[PDB]
Amino acid sequence: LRNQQAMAANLQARQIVLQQSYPVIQQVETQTFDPANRSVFDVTPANVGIVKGFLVKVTAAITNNHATEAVALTDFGPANLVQRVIYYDPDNQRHTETSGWHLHFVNTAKQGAPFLSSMVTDSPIKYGDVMNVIDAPATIAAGATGELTMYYWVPLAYSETDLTGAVLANVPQSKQRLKLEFANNNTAFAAVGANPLEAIYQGAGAADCEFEEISYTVYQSYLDQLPVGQNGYILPLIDLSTLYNLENSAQAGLTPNVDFVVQYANLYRYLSTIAVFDNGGSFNAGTDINYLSQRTANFSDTRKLDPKTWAAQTRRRIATDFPKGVYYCDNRDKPIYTLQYGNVGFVVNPKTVNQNARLLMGYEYFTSRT
Amino acid sequence: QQAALRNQQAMAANLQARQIVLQQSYPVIQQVETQTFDPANRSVFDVTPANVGIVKGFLVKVTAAITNNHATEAVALTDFGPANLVQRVIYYDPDNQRHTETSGWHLHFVNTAKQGAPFLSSMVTDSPIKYGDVMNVIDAPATIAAGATGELTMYYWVPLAYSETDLTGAVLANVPQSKQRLKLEFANNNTAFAAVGANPLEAIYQGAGAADCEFEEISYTVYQSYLDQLPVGQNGYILPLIDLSTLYNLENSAQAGLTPNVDFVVQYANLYRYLSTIAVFDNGGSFNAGTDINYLSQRTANFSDTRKLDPKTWAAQTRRRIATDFPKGVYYCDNRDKPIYTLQYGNVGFVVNPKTVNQNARLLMGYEYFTSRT
């Protein structure tokens, strides 16, 4: 029995906390540097109240020192300003450990539209891209310097109203660790013909491109003035004892017309799946895939679909398509959850497979701390 | 006398079972049929879906290649364009009862209304990250030049259940005996291309090269969405009996007899609970942006208009629902929270008072409604 009451209590406590505490977003750290010298930073957030997440602002100036050749944005562009992120809580338990581009795509999936974008409308009133919140020049010509701005939301809590995954740090004492690895002069620029997956710009002038400098500012979002009751602080024990993490992985071994299956692990409740078909450095709009699906061993496919129909389901979630070769799957209402390892798999049956082909997977999931 | 308690209890039992079904079953979307054909040979198909569990609806993918063989003249998309790839869709459940029976354009406008934006469209934003129209889910060239071939893709969702969370209208398909039937009447070389000056309503392209346009092929794939592994209990399968005994249908009709400055009234039938109404003013083949209308309204037996509005103000209400305007001459009315039901009040009618009326003018009406199977 039980649980019904455990969950009922958790939810009641969550509601009291949301109703009684007050949300705060506060700058915790800012820094400007030259990636030629350093590109990995460990940010120390403040241990106060219940921490919900971190908004990371990144600005950069890129100079194309080439004599005559320009470079142009890759499909991910400024989303590759941060290569990776890792968060450790006060108890030394890791939550999210993923790439900047995967983190960005999840930010978009959760918003229901390209993250922090400005939607174009016919309004005569001058709304629009006034503030260049997420911005990067389409091209940087030989001899020019371009200015970029990127934002990432590193979540602990699942949402503003669902505190599952949030972290209690008003007491812990031990420090939190938000590790950020930024793009550098070796990852940001891809030569013509090279794989643009992790790069920001690609083109004939790439070898002579460099960062003038990069700056970041981390804002911490948390709940303060936590409600106190009889036994003390009123807290959603299930929420705070659950991890909400994003993680990535890479898989290879694809062959034309054969089902390539990536197994889901047990224990984790997978809310979403992203699969990027890095076809040997080529990123195609579904033309190199026969179909994608999610399958249960001995229960077949629950959604075996051609690429365009798969894309149609995604258009219902983010109001547009993710970039070429990027495929999304929403399982939020009924998370993939198997008691046995791989009782469910993500499937891609490729039509064309180039040399060095691989699927880069990204996952959003919930799992117990214990 | 009272005893109406039964209804109250029935509603509660229906809602409880619906919730259990949604919580316990697992959603599946599966391909049931795919065919490529030449419209010159055939354009009407009857698809037999699978009989598995509770059926929620069908996602129909349609692609086509159209060549404009005219020596010199081009053609351009009509206002409806690829939404006219399917001319009519009709669904019959295992008991042979008809549910949706409407035009492809009407079905598409309802798909848009229920999404809250142009169905399966890609919005435009200032994002530097390369989101956008990457996959061309619904797509058609704006023009097809003399000698060129254009490729089109469009999708339609044929609903049985009202939504993913409201199973009203869903169909229980477990009787091996009788099959469901999804009939699709596609566009062909006689409906898809309109000459200059001809009525573009049902066409995909219109222009001086129309007589020489032809389909190279049309292909369709029907995906069936359903709930499998239905929950069982002491009394067997737990099922929302009201949901499964209610029809959620889309239907269209045509009415004529409009005269300048006179109220043209289209009565709503009794028994049906109308969720939305679409009125297309086909003004003799001309489709105007409200300029041929004085006002539109919904009116009850009492001369009482609940929303008698000028065309732009009517359009403003629609912009709040789908974030843009429907095509020229297409007007929408949302009555989802308080469905038009002639039992609730007297008879009710949809009103259009035209400013200008061309020859062969008519109002094409599209309705979304719930009604008891019995």
Add this chain to the structure above:
Amino acid sequence: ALRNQQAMAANLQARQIVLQQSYPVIQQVETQTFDPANRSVFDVTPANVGIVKGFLVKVTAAITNNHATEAVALTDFGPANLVQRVIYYDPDNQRHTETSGWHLHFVNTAKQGAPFLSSMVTDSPIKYGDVMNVIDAPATIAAGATGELTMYYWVPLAYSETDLTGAVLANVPQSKQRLKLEFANNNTAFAAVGANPLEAIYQGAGAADCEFEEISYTVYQSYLDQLPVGQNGYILPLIDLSTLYNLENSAQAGLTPNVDFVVQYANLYRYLSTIAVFDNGGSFNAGTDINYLSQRTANFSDTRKLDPKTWAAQTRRRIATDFPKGVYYCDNRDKPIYTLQYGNVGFVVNPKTVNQNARLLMGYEYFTSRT
């Protein structure tokens, strides 16, 4: 405290019953076409029927640029400046909203979650789009040309379609409501180059020779009819109907570089949103003249001290785009600013650059009780 908890419960129940039992109606109250050179202020008399939720005001205009050679171009606010001011008084002559057309329009956008009544651009091949020109104005009006404009404003009484807080019960036959509309005229609508464009619709070298040809308005009143009756007469949400939901704006001056300019939430209202327009001496900049913005409590602690782009990011989550240059928005809907819950609170702007005649135009959305 029990009297209150029960009072709130009774209110919500009454609201729920009114919404379920009554039927919403929207109907034209009045239409007028005029030349603002003749008259620009109008007192519209709403119909006294049931519970009134608000008014949708359609405004159209024709403007002619008769300059010999120069054009004019839309200002950042453009057609939102067709109405300069709006003021509403209920049957007891209690004033509710009194604000500028631009502020009212920005709140309409904030409440919609996107530019008010706009048409979103998509890749759809089906011809959806700006078909009906619901809100529209030509980007420029060339010398010798005439442009046509359309604008809509929603004047709220009720907070929303489902929350009747602020609504007005108008069933007293001899006590009239008053909706006063003050329209733009040739003096307010056209700004010369270098002049402050804040209140103007068009600005350019051809401004001196621009004239309205006409303006027309149609007011539609939205209300609930066939009010439910019970064992005590009309079932009514008493708290909803005795609470005012208003918009108001004011101007604050006294800014100096790198110093915190604090605008205290001076009243004991429950502030749902705040809009701050940095009219930097006629210049409207995209955050570049600001170090940071914030909301601060007497405790001297900031709940959201942010650089301009990050502040803008929060707004992009609310309206899917940015407000025009120099316009900053702050959402406090779920936890309204109320100085009696915490120390006095202030809205803060620390300017990086301050031109002559700089000022902050503040717009507030708030709830307050009649008594």
Add this chain to the structure above:
Amino acid sequence: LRNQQAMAANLQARQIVLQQSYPVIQQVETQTFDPANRSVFDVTPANVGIVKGFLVKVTAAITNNHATEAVALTDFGPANLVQRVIYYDPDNQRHTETSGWHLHFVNTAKQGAPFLSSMVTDSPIKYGDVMNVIDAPATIAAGATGELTMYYWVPLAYSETDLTGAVLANVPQSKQRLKLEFANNNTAFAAVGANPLEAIYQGAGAADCEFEEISYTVYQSYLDQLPVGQNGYILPLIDLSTLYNLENSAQAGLTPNVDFVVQYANLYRYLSTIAVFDNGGSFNAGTDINYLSQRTANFSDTRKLDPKTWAAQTRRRIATDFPKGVYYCDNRDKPIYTLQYGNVGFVVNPKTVNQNARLLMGYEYFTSRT
């Protein structure tokens, strides 16, 4: 309980009456007139024994006075010599109230072949159309006069062996009323392009056509020498307390591809239904209809059929098709009967709908006097 015995007694009494009484068919009235002067007549039948029905013979001479244009029979032709019929019994209760064409179509349905027609066979013996019982020239040329003969059976009793609906008038005293409205110079002739529904002839010479004269003879069929027993006359009380009526109605509001439903009323036991699709004056052979059906609310269609298949069922009943646009439905063995109004409806889903379209309905039914 009961009833079983009430019906058993009714049927026994019916049998005794049929066995003991003697059938008589007797002329009750004849009249010749010019429709320019009068066209409505109220015939007074004799109050004798149990009345079963009336055979109405109508003859007419039509002159086409046009100078050069002829006219040709409409689809209903001589069946429109009588426009309407109404019968009132001795107790002032109406039985049949319908059009001449509907009455004629029911006469045909009950016979199982075109009413009083002569069937063509290969017999060398000279059987055939010798007596021109129901007859009318196919065309009447300019300047010519055509002679027509039409017969109608106005039923009270359902049949020769089922006295349900018969009328006892051996006592009543109060008079019966058989009202007949004949065609006139305004209804019998349709101009080219005009609606031919109620007309006898249509054509370019119609404006100059006229009746030379019309004559009618009414024959009354009844049972005399009624059997007497202990309590007195032996009579089937249920038969005599039941009305067997034919009635017509008109419905409009048809729209392409939408189900047009005509509700059946409650209380009446409907034996047959006739629906005429007057498509704005055009009468088509099913090509303007998608399907017809009879439907029960919440029990769907019991016979949703394409027009030709619907016509096939009718061919089994009358050995041929009714005229263009005329559809018949037999429900004699299991009469449409709902306790709630419209718990059953007759359906027509039209393919094509012209201006002024409507369905003219005709019903045959049983219902209690009380």
Add this chain to the structure above:
Amino acid sequence: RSVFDVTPANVGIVKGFLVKVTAAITNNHATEAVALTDFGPANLVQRVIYYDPDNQRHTETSGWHLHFVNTAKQGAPFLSSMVTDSPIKYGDVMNVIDAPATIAAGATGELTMYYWVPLAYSETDLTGAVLANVPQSKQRLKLEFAN
């Protein structure tokens, strides 16, 4: 294709099937015509075979034989329109069973024919009817058409 296997619904007691068949035939010969054979449209269906839910075979015969029995049981040419002297326009209005007597060189003829495949002996004698309520096994109506 010319052979089809129809799966009827399993609802209650099945009495039979009414099968409507239509066809368009073009005589592409340059000069010569063709004329209906004695059986004509009755040969649109070459053979019909029915199996009940227990997979037991009932009728298994030719279209012409089935049609002649339909006629025998009706007591007249099946679904035919008799000819009479009636001036009222009854007649072959709906062309329920119809086929052009000849199809000229270059012409296209349209045909319609119906067959009643009986399970029950008649509408009142249910001998031969089939109880179809077992969701497991389906009935099967096989039609081998002319080609």
Add this chain to the structure above:
Amino acid sequence: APATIAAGATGELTMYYWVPLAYSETDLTGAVLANVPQSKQRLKLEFAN
């Protein structure tokens, strides 16, 4: 099936497949009970082209 089909020639082929449900004629493991009039079995064949 003809071992070769020459230029201009037509070859005729015949092949048979046994699709098993039961393991064998004597071992009914895998066999299918098909008596529910409701749902049909389905044998899908994707041929060469």
Add this chain to the structure above:
Amino acid sequence: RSVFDVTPANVGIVKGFLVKVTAAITNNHATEAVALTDFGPANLVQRVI
């Protein structure tokens, strides 16, 4: 067309299906022949489900 869905009869216990496939193939090449692959006619059916 090359894909078919066959609906078998629902009678008793089903053991399996014997599928007979025949075909006529013409080699229209002007000069060159073709020869059976190792699988040959066994590839007349590509997939069965």
